[PDB]
Structures are given as structure tokens and as C-alpha cells.
Amino acid sequence: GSHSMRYFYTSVSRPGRGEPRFIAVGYVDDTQFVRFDSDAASQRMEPRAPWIEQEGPEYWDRNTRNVKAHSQTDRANLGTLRGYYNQSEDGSHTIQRMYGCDVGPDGRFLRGYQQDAYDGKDYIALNEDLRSWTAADMAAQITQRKWETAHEAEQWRAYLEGRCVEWLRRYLENGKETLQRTDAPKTHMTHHAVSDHEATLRCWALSFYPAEITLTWQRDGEDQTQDTELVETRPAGDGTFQKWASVVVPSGQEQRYTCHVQHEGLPKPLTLRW
């Protein structure tokens, strides 16, 4: 269907210790394809997906140059924002940035985004029009006026509507085999007595891609979140994901309960019954 390219940057100040650490990762959909770590030895953008390895030395030179510039910018930003908030040089603080673009099934630009956080809280975001900013507080309004004067939105808009989408389309082509696949979940149920009175039913989804999935329990067709446990979707390690949902039911009543699995790779949702 639609696809996305996203970069995730984390900068953490290490007071007492050395320079702040900067880590960048790039994803297409739920597949990571590059990383940069300011502490690693290479000091280069590195491949993390088979289909990005065919990019030439100029690709890696450019992406290293630019992400290294970003890392210096985000180190400067940690001290700047410490000043904005009048915080001491003693505490550790975090700047996060997420940016990227979505394309539709036709491959045409759907939306772009850029949002920044400080200590895990929203700081400033590029608005949906890619022409204006939404600041979270007074410190962020200083940044907004700075970026308005510097025409920073124009720089991001031209990237998000241009090279972001063009290079995403290229990655989807070069990694058709991985990125344009859907792996339907392999499903099963387990059943374990809690006592004579009760038993746990656990509904499993394994080996699926993309990560998006819905697991729901019903009892005689009624939505059932009472006594249910839903774990966060988790990576299997091989590029697929896993999820389960459990419910505790009265012994002998297992037949009333259905687990409902919805996933893009399933032409019709599955219903599982013990």
C-alpha cells in the first residue's frame, strides 16, 4: 500500500563524561537500512540492510557528510536548549528528531514531517503544510522565530517533497524482495490451566511483516478486554514481528472465545477457537 522513510536521531549530553553521543537510524517502513553513531570507530554512515549496499561511494560520502553535520548541530542544540531552560551543566538531557515522508500506492508524495523533542517531550514540529511551525513552549518559540527568519521550513519542504520521496521510491525498487512483501502471520493458540476453575487462552501471531496487526478476543461475539492481556508487537530478529493476546476463561467454557487476527497479508481476517 503506502510506504514511509523515516530518520530517527537521538542526542544525549554526557556531563562529566565526553562529548554528547549522537545516534541516527534510517528506516523504510519497519525495516532499518542505515545507522550513524558518533562513538563508533568508522565515523561513517553504515549499511544495515542488504539492498542499501549497492549504493556507490558518493552515496556514502554524502550521507556521512550530512549526518555528521546534523550531529554537530544537535550537539550545539543541547547547550542552546540548556540555556533556554536555564538548566545546570550537571544534568544529562536528550534531543530527539524524527523526519521523513510517506508515499501512496502510486508512489506519489503523501505527506512529510519533522518533529523535535527535548527530554522526551514535544519541543517543535513542522506543520503539515511544510510551511509553518508549531512550538510547544516559550523556549521553542525562540527556535521558531529563528527558523522563520532563516527560511528553514523551505529547506525541509523542498527535501521532504523531493529527495526524500525520490530516494524512498528508489529503495522500494531496489528492495522489492524485502520491502514490498507481506508476510501473513502464522497463528496458533496455547491453553494452560490456571486452576480447576480457570484457564489461560493465548492467541499467537508469528513471522509477520509489516509490524501492524490487530489481535482481539471475543466471548460469544462480544468484544472482550476484561481479563485480557495484549503484549506490544516485538521483533523476531529476522525481519518479522510477533504478538500475542491472552484471556483467562472459566474451565470448560473455552468454546465461547474467539481470537480475531487482522493483518495486511490476510485476505480475510482469521478467527481462532480452542
Binding site: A69, T73, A76, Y99, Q155, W156
Partner: peptide, 9 residues
Amino acid sequence: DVMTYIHSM
């Protein structure tokens, strides 16, 4: 392909 130069905060 990452973004180009980003303006400081």
C-alpha cells in the same frame, strides 16, 4: 538519503 544542512535551534 538524509536531509541537508539543518539550522540550529
